[PDB]
Amino acid sequence: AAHGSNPEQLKHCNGILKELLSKKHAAYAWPFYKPVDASALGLHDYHDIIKHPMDLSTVKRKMENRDYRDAQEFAADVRLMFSNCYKYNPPDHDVVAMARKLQDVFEFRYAKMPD
Amino acid sequence: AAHGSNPEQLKHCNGILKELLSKKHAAYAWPFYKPVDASALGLHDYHDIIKHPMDLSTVKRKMENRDYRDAQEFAADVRLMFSNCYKYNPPDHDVVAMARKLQDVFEFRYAKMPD
Ligand SMILES: O=c1nc(Nc2cccc(Cl)c2)oc2cc(Cl)oc(=O)c12
Ligand SMILES: O=c1nc(Nc2cccc(Cl)c2)oc2cc(Cl)oc(=O)c12
Structure with a gap:
């Protein structure tokens, strides 16, 4: 159901994505810039625990390839990225605190979606 | 795409839903128990700002009516509820702190989804 709102909402999503990738948030966004390299990290x-890996460079490639058909699809991926982090890591790990901070950035601006 | 996993994952979702409704979290979940009564609150x-209201009693009715076909659909609704709160209220409002606490409960247990 391609709504006329979908491109405008996808622009807002791309703006969020650019912000998550910006230096403003680099101190806590950096673990999510690229796909988890599980072997390099030991x-x-x-990949037994996380069946659907996601990261911001993948979200960016999908956005640039016009893979997302709507804001909901884009939001599901960004939240999947954070969920994978909460699934794999103990709750008191530093990367979990970083994920919650970045997700806070994401959720509050996603909530400002034009509609 | 009804996967064989969908009913088992929907059970986990129903467990999350029961927990969000439980007395364990009542001190911060209560604003989300029922649909926002905008007129009663002034x-x-x-309803000009929030185009898709959502609350836990609606999520519960949908679950009981077998409206959700998959865990993703259920998660989109619960997150919509929180997003509506972040959209409408100033970030330093008490209800926003409550929403973030409940969403923390939701996201960390949603991340434990069987798969
Ligand atoms: O999201 C994650 N991002 C990262 N980034 C990362 C961490 C250290 C070095 C480098 Cl090059 C990248 O590593 C993770 C490790 C674990 Cl255990 O779980 C995760 O969810 C993540
Ligand atoms: O989610 C919300 N839940 C509530 N509950 C609520 C608050 C006071 C009394 C009663 Cl009976 C219910 O009120 C809200 C008010 C505003 Cl401004 O935004 C909201 O998002 C919510």
């Missing part, structure tokens, strides 16, 4: 159970 | 702009 996390040999990561 | 929020005469609420």
Whole structure:
């Protein structure tokens, strides 16, 4: 159901995406810039636990390829990225605190979606 | 695409839903128990700002009526509820702090989804 709102809402999503990637948030966004390299980090159970990896460079490639048909699809991916982090890591890990901070940035601006 | 996982994942979702409704979290979940009554609260702009209201009693009715076909649909509704709160209220409002606490409960247990 391609709504006329979809392109305008996808622009807002792209703006959020640019912000998450910006230096404003780099101190806590950086773990999510690129796909988790499980072997390089010694996390040999990561791909058994996480069945759908996601990261901001993948979200960016999808946006640039016009893969997302609506804001909801884009939001599901960004939230999947954070969920994977909450699934794999103990709740008191530093990367979890970073994920919650970035997700806070994401959720509050996603909530400002034009409609 | 009804996967064989969908009913088992929908059980996990129903467990999350029961937990969000439980007395364990009542001190911060209560604003989300029932649909926002905008007139009763004097929020005469609420339904201009919020185009898709959502609350836990609606999520519960949908679950009981077998409206959700998958965990993703259920998660989109719960997150919509929180997003509506972040959209309408100033970020330093008490209800926003409550929403973030409840959403924390939701996201960390949603991340434990069987798969
Ligand atoms: O989201 C994650 N991002 C990262 N980034 C990362 C961390 C250290 C070095 C480099 Cl090059 C990248 O690593 C993770 C490790 C674990 Cl255990 O879980 C995760 O969810 C993530
Ligand atoms: O989610 C919300 N839940 C509530 N509950 C609520 C608040 C006071 C009394 C009663 Cl009976 C219910 O009120 C809200 C007011 C505003 Cl401004 O925004 C909101 O998002 C919400």
